[PDB]
Every structure is written in C-alpha cells, then in structure tokens.
PDB file of N, CA and C in Angstrom:
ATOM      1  N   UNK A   1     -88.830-209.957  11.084  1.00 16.83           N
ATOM      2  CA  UNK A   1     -90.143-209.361  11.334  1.00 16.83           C
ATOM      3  C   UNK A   1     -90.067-207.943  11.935  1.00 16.83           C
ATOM      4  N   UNK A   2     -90.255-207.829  13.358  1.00 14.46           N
ATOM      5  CA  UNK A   2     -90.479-206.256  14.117  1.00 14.46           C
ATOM      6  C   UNK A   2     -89.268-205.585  13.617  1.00 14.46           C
ATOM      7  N   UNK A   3     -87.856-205.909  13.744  1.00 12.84           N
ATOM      8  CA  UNK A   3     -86.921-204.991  13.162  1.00 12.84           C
ATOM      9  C   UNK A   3     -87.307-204.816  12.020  1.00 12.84           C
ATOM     10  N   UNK A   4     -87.265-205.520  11.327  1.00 13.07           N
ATOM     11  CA  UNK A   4     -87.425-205.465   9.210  1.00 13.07           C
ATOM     12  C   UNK A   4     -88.380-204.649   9.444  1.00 13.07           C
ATOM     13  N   UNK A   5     -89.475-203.970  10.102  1.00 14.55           N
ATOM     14  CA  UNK A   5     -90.571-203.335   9.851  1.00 14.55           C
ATOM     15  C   UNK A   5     -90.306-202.424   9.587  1.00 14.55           C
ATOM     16  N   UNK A   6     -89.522-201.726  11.009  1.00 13.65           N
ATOM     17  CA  UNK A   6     -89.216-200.697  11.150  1.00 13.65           C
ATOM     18  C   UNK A   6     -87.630-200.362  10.310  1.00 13.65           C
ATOM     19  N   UNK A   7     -86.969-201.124   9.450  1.00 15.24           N
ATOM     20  CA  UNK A   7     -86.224-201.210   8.502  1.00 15.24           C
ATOM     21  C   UNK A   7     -86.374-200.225   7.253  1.00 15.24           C
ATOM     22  N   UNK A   8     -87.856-201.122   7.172  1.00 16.77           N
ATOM     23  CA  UNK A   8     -88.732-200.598   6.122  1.00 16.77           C
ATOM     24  C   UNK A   8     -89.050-198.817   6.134  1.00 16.77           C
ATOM     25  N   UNK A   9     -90.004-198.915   7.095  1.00 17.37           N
ATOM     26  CA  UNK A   9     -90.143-197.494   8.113  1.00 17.37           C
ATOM     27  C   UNK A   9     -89.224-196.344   7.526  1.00 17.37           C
ATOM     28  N   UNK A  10     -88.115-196.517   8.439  1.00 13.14           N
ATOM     29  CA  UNK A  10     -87.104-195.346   8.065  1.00 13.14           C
ATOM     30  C   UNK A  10     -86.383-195.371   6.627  1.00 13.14           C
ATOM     31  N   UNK A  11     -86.432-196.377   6.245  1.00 12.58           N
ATOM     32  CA  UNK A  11     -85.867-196.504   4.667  1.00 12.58           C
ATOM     33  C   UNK A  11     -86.769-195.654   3.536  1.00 12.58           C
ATOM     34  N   UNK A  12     -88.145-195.411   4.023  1.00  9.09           N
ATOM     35  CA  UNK A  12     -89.233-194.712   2.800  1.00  9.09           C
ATOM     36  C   UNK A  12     -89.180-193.261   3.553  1.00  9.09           C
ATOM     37  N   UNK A  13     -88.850-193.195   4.547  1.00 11.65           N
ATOM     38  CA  UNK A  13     -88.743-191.601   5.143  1.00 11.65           C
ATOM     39  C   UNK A  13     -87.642-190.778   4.425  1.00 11.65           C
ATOM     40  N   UNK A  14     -86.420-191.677   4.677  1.00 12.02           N
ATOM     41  CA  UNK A  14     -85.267-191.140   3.500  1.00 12.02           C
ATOM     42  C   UNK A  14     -85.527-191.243   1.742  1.00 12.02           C
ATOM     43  N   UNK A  15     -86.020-192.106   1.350  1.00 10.84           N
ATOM     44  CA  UNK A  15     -86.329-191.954  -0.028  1.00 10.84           C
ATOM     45  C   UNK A  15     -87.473-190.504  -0.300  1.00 10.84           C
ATOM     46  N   UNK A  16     -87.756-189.912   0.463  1.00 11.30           N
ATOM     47  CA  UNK A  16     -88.779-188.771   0.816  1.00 11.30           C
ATOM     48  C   UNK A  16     -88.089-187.596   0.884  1.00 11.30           C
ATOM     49  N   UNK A  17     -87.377-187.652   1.931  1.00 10.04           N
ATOM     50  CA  UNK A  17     -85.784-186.690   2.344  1.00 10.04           C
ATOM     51  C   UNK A  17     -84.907-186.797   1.543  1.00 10.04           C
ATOM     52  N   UNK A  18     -84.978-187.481   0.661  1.00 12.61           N
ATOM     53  CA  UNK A  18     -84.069-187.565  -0.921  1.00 12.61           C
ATOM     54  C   UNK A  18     -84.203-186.650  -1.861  1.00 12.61           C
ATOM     55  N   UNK A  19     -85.908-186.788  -2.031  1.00 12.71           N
ATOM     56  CA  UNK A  19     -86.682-186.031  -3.463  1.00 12.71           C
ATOM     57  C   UNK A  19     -87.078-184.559  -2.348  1.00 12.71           C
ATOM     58  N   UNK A  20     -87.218-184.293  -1.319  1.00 13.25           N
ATOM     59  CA  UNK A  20     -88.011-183.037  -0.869  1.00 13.25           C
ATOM     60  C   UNK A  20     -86.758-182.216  -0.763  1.00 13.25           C
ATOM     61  N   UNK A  21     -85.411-182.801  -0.441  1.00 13.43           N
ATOM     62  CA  UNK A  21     -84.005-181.682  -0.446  1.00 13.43           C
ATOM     63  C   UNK A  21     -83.245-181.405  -1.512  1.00 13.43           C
ATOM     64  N   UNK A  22     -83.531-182.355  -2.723  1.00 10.54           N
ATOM     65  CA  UNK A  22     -83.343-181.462  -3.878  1.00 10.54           C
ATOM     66  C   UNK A  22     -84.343-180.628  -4.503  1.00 10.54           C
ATOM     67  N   UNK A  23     -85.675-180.330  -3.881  1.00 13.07           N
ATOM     68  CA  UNK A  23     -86.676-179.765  -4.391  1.00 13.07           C
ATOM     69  C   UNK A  23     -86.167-178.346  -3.423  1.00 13.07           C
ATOM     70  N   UNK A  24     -85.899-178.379  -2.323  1.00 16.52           N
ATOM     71  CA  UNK A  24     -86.066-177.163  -1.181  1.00 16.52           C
ATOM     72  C   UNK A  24     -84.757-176.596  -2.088  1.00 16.52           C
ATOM     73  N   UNK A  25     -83.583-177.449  -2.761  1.00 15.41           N
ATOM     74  CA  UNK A  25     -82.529-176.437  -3.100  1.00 15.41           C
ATOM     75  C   UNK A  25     -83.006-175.765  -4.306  1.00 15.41           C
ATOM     76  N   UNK A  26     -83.426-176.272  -5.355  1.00 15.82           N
ATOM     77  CA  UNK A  26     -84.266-176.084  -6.185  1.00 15.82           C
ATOM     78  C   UNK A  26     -84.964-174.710  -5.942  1.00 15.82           C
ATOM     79  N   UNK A  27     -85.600-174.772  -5.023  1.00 13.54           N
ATOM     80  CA  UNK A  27     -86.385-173.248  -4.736  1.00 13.54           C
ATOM     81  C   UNK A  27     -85.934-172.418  -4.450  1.00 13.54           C
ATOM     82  N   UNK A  28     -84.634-172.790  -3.018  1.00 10.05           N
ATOM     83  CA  UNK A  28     -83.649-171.409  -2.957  1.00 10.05           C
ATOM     84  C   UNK A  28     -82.855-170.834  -4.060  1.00 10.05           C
ATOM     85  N   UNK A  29     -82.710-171.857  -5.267  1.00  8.98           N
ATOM     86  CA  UNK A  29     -81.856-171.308  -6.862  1.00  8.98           C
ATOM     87  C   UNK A  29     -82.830-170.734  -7.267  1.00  8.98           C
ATOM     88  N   UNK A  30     -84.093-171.046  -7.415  1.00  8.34           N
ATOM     89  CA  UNK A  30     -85.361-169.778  -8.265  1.00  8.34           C
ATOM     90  C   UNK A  30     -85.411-168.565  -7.088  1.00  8.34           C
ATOM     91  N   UNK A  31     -85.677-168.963  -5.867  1.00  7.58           N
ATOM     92  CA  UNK A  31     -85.556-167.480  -5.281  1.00  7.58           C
ATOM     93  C   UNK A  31     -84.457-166.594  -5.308  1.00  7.58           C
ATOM     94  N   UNK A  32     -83.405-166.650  -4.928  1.00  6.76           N
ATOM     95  CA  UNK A  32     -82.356-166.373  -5.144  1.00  6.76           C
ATOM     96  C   UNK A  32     -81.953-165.430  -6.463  1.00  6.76           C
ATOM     97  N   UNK A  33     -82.395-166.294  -7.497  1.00  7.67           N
ATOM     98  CA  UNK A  33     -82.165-165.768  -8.817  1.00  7.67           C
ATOM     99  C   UNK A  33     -83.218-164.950  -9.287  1.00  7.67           C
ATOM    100  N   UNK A  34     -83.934-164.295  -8.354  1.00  9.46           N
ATOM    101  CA  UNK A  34     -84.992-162.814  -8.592  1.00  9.46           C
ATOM    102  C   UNK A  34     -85.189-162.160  -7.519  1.00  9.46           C
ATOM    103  N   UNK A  35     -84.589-162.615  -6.335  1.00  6.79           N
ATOM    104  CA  UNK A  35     -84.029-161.814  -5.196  1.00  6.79           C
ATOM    105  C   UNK A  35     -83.140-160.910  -5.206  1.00  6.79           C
ATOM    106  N   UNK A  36     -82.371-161.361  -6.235  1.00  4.63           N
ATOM    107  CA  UNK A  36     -80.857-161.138  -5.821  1.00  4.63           C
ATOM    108  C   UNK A  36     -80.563-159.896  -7.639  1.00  4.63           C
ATOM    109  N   UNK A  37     -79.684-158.395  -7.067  1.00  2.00           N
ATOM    110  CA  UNK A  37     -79.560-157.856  -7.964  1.00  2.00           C
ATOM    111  C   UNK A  37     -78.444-156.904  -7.557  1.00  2.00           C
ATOM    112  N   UNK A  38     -78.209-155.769  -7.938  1.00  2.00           N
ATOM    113  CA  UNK A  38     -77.160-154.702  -7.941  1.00  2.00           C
ATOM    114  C   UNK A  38     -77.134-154.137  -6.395  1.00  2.00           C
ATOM    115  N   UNK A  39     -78.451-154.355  -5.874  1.00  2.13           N
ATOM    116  CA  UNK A  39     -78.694-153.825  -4.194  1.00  2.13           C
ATOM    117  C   UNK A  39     -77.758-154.692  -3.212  1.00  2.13           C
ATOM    118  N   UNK A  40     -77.632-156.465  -3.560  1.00  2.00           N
ATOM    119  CA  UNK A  40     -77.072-157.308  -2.971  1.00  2.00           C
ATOM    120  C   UNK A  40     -75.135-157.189  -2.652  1.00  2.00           C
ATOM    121  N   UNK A  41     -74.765-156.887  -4.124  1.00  2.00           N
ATOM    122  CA  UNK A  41     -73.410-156.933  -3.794  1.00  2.00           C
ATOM    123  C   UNK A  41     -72.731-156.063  -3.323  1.00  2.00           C
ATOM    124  N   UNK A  42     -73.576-154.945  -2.835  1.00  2.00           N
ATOM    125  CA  UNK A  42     -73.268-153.464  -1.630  1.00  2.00           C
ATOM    126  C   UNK A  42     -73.000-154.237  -0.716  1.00  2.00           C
ATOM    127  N   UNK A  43     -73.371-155.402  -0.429  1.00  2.00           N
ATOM    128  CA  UNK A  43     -73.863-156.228   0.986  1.00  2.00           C
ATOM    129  C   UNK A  43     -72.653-157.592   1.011  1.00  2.00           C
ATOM    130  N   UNK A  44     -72.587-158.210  -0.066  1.00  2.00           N
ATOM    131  CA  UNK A  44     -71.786-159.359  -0.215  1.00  2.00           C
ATOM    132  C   UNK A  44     -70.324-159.216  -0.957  1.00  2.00           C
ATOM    133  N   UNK A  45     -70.280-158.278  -1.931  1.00  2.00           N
ATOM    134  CA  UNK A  45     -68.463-157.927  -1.855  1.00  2.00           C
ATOM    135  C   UNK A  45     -67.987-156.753  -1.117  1.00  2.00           C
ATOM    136  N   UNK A  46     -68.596-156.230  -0.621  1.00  2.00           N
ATOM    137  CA  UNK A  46     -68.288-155.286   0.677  1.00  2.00           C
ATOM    138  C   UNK A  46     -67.917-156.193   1.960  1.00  2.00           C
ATOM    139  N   UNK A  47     -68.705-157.923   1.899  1.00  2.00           N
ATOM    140  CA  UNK A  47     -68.588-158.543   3.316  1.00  2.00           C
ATOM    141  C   UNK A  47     -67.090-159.214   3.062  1.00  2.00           C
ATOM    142  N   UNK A  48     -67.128-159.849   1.663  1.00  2.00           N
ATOM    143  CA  UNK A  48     -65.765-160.375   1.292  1.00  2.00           C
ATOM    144  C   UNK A  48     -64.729-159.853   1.436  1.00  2.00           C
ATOM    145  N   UNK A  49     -64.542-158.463   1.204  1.00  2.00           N
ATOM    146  CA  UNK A  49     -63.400-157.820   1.766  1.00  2.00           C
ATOM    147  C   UNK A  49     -63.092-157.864   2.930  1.00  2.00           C
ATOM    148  N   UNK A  50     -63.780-157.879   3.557  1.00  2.00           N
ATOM    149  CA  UNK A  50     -63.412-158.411   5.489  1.00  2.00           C
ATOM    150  C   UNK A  50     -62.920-159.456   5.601  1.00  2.00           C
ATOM    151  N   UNK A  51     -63.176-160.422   4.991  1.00  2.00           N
ATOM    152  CA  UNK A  51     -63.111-162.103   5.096  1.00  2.00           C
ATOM    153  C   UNK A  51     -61.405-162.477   4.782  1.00  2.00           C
TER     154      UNK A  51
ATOM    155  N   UNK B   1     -75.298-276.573  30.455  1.00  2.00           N
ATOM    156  CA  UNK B   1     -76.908-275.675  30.566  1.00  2.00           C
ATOM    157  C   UNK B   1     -76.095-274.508  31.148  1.00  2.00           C
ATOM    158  N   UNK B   2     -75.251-274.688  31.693  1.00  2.00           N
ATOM    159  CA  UNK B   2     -74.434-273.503  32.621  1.00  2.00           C
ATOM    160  C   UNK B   2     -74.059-272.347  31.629  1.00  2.00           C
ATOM    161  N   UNK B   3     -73.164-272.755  30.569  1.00  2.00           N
ATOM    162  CA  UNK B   3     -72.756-272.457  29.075  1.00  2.00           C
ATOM    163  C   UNK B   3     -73.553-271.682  28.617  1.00  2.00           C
ATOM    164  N   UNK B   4     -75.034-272.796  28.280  1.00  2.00           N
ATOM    165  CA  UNK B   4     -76.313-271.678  27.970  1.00  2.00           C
ATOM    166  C   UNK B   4     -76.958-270.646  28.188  1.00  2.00           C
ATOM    167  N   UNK B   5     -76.624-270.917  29.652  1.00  2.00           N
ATOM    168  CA  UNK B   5     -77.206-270.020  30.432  1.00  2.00           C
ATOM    169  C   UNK B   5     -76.197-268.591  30.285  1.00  2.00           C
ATOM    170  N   UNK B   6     -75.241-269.160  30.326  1.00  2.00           N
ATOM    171  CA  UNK B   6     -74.271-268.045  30.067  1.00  2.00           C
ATOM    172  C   UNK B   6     -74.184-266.745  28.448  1.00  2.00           C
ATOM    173  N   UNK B   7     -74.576-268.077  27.413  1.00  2.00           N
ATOM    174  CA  UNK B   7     -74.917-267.833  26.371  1.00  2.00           C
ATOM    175  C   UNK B   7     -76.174-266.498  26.381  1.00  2.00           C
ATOM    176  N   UNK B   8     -77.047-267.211  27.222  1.00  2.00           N
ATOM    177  CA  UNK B   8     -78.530-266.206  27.206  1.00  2.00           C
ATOM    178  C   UNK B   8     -78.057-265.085  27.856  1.00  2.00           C
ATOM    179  N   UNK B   9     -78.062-264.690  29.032  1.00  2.00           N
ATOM    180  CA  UNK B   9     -77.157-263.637  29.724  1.00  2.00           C
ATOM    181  C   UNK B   9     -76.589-262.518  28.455  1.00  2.00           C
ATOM    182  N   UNK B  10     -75.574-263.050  27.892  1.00  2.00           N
ATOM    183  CA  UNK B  10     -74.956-262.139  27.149  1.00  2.00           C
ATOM    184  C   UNK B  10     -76.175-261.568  25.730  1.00  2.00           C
ATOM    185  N   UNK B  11     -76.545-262.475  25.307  1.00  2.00           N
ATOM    186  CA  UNK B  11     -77.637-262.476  24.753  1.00  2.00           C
ATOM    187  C   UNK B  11     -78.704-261.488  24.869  1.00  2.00           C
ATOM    188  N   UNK B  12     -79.792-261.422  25.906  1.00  2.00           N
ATOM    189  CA  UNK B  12     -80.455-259.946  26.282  1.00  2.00           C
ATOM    190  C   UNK B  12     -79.643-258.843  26.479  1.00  2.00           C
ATOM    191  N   UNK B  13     -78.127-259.048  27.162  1.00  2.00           N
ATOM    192  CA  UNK B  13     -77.523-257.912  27.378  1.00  2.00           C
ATOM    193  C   UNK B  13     -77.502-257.314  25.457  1.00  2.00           C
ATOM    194  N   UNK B  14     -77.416-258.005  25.062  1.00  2.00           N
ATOM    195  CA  UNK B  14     -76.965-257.136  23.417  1.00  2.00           C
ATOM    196  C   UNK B  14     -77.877-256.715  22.789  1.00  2.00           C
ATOM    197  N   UNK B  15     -79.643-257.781  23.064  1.00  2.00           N
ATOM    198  CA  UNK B  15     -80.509-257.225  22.292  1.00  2.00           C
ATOM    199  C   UNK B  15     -81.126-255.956  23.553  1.00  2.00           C
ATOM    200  N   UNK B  16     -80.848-255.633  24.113  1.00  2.00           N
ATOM    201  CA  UNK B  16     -81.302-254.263  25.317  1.00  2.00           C
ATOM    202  C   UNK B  16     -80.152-253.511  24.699  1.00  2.00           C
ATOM    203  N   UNK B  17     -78.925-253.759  24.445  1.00  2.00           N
ATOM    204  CA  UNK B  17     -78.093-252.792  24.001  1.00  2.00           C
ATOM    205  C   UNK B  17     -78.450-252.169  22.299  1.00  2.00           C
ATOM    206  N   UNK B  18     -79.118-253.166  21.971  1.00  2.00           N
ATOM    207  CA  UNK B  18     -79.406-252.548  20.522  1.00  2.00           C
ATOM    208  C   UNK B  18     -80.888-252.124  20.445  1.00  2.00           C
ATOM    209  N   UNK B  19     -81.978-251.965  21.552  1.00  2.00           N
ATOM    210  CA  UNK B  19     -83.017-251.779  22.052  1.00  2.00           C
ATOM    211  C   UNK B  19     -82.549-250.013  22.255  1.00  2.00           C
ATOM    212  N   UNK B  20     -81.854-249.792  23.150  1.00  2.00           N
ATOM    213  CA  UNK B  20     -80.984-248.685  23.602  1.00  2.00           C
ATOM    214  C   UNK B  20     -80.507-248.082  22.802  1.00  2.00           C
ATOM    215  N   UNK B  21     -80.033-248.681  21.922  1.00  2.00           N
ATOM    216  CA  UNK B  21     -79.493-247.320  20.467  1.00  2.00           C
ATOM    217  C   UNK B  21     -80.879-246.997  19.487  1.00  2.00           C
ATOM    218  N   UNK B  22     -81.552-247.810  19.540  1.00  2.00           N
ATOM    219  CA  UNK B  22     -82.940-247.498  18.898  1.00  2.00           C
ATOM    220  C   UNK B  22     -84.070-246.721  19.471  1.00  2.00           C
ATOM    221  N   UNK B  23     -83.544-246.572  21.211  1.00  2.00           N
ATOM    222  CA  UNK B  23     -84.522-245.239  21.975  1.00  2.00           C
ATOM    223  C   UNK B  23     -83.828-243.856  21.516  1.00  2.00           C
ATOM    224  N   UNK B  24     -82.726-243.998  21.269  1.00  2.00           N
ATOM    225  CA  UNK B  24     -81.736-242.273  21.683  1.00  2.00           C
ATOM    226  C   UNK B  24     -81.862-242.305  19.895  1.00  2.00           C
ATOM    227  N   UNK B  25     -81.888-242.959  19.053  1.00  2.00           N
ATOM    228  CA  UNK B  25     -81.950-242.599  17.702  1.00  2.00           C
ATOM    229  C   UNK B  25     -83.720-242.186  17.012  1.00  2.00           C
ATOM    230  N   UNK B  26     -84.827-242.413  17.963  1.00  2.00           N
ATOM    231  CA  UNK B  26     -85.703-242.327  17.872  1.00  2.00           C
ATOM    232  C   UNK B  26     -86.510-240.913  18.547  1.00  2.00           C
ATOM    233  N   UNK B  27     -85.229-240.381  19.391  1.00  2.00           N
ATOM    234  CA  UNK B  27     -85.469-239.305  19.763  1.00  2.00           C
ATOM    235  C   UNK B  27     -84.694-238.238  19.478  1.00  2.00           C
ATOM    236  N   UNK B  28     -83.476-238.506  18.288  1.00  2.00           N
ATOM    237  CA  UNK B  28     -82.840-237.661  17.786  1.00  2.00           C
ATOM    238  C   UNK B  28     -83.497-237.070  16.654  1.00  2.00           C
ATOM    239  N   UNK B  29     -84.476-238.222  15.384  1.00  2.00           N
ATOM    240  CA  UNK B  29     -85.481-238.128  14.954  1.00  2.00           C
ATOM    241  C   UNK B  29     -86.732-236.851  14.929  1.00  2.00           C
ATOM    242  N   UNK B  30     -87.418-237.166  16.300  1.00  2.00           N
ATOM    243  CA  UNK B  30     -88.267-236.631  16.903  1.00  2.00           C
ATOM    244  C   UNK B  30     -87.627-234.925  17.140  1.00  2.00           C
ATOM    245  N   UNK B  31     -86.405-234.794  17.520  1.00  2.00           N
ATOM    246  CA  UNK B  31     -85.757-233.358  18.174  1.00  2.00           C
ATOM    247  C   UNK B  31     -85.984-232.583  16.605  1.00  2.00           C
ATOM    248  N   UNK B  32     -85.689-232.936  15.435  1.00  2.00           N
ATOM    249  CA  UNK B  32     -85.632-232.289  14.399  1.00  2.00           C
ATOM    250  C   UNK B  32     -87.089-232.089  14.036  1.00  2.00           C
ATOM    251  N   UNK B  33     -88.528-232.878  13.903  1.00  2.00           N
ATOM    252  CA  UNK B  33     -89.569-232.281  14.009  1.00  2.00           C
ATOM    253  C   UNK B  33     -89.812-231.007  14.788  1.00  2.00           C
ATOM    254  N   UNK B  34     -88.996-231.207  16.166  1.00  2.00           N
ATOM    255  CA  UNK B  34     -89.811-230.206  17.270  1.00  2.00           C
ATOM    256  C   UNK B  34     -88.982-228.789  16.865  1.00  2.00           C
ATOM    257  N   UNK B  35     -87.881-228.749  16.092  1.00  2.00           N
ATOM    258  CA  UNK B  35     -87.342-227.675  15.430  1.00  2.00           C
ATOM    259  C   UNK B  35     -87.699-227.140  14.107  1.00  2.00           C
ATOM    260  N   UNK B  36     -87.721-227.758  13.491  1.00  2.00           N
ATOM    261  CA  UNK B  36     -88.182-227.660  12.124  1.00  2.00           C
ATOM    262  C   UNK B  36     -89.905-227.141  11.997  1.00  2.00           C
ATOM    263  N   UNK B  37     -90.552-227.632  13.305  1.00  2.00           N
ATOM    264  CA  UNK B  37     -91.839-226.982  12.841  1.00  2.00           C
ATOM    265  C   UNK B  37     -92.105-225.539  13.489  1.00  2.00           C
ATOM    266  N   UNK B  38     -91.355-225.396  14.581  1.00  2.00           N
ATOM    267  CA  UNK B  38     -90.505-223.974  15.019  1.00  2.00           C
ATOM    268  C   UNK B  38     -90.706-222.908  14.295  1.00  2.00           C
ATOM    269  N   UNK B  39     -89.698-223.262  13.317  1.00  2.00           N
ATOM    270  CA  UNK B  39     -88.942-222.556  12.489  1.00  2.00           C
ATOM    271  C   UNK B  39     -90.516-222.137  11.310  1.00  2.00           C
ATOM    272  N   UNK B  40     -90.525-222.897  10.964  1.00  2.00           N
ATOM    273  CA  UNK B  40     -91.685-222.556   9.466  1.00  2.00           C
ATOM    274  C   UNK B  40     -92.883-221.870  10.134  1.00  2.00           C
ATOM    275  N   UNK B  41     -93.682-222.501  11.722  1.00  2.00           N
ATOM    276  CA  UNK B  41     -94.259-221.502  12.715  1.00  2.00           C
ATOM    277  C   UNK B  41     -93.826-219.811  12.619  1.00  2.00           C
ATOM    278  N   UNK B  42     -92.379-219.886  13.280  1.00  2.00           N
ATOM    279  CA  UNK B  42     -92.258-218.411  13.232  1.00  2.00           C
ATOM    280  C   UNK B  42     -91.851-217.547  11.967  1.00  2.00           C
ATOM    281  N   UNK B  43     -91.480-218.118  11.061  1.00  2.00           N
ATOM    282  CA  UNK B  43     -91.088-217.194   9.688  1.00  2.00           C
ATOM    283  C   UNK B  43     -92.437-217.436   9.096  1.00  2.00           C
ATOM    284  N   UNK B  44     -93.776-218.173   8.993  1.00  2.00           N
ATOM    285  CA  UNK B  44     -94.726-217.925   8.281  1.00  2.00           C
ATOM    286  C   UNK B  44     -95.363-216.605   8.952  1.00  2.00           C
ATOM    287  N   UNK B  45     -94.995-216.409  10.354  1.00  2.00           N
ATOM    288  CA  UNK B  45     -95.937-215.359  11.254  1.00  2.00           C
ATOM    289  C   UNK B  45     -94.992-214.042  11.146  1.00  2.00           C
ATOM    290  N   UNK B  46     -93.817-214.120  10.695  1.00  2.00           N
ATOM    291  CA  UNK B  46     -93.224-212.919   9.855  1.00  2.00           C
ATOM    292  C   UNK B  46     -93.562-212.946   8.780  1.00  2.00           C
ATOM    293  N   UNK B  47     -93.935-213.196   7.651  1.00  2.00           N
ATOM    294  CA  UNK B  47     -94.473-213.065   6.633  1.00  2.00           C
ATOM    295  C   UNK B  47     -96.270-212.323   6.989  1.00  2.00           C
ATOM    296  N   UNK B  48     -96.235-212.992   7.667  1.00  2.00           N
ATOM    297  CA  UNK B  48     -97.857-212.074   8.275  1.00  2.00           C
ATOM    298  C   UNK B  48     -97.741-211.207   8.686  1.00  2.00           C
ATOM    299  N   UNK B  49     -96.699-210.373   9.277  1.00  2.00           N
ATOM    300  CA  UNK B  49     -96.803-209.289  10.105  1.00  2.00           C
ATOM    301  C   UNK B  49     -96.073-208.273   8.800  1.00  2.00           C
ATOM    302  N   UNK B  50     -94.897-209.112   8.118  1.00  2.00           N
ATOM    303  CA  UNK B  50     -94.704-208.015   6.996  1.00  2.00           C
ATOM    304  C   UNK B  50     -95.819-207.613   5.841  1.00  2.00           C
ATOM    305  N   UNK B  51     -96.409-208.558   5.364  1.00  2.00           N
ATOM    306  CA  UNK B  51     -97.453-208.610   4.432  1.00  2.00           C
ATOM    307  C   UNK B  51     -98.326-206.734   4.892  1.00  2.00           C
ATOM    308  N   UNK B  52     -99.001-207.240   6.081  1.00  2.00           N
ATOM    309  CA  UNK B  52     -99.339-206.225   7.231  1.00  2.00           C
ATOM    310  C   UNK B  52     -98.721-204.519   7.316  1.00  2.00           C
TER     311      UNK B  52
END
C-alpha cells in the first residue's frame, strides 16, 4: 500500500525525465546547428590548442 | 468394587485427557480464522488506497 504509492509516484516522474531529456538534447542539436558558424571556431580550435 | 473403582479412576482420567486435546485443537482452529481474516482485512484496504 503507502510504499507502493509512492513507488508508483517516483516511477511516472522518471518516465517524464525520460521523454523531456531527450527532447532538451534535441533542442540544444537544433540550436546549436544555426548558432554555430565560421565566428565559433576562432573560439573553439583556438581553445583546443591549449588543451 | 475396589478394581472398579480403580477401573473408573483411570477411566475419566482418559476421557478429560481426550476432552483436553479437543480444547487446544479447537483453538488451533479458531487462531487461523483470527489470521486469515487479518490478512484479506488489510490487503482489501490496500487495494482501496491503490485503486485511490
């Protein structure tokens, strides 16, 4: 009963946190991919060389 | 009559002894009602609270 409830509970929170964090990556690949152009890699293979 | 008497003696002693296994078997009986209706009590009232 009271445990199994709350079983239940957190078990549909993660099936939620399942579908909403492949959606949030999802959006950073569309942003990303019209963010991002010839201005960026002044910034990111300029940082790699440090690394 | 002494004999008899002796006879009787042993006599109630056995039917009280088999009187006596028929109290403690009559309440071993009884212990499994007072569990068994327990049990179907509290898992029907989880089924109510999950339903819920």
């Amino acid at each position: 009963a009271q445990a199994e409830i709350e079983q239940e509970l957190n078990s549909v929170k993660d099936a939620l946190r399942a579908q909403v964090g492949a959606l949030a990556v999802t959006g950073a690949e569309k942003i990303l991919g019209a963010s991002i152009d010839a201005n960026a890699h002044e910034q990111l293979v300029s940082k790699l060389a440090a690394e | 009559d002494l004999e008899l008497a002796h006879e009787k003696a042993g006599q109630q002693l056995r039917e009280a002894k088999a009187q006596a296994a028929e109290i403690v078997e009559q309440a071993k009986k009884r212990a499994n009602q007072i569990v068994d209706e327990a049990r179907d009590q509290a898992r029907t009232e989880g089924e109510r609270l999950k339903a819920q």
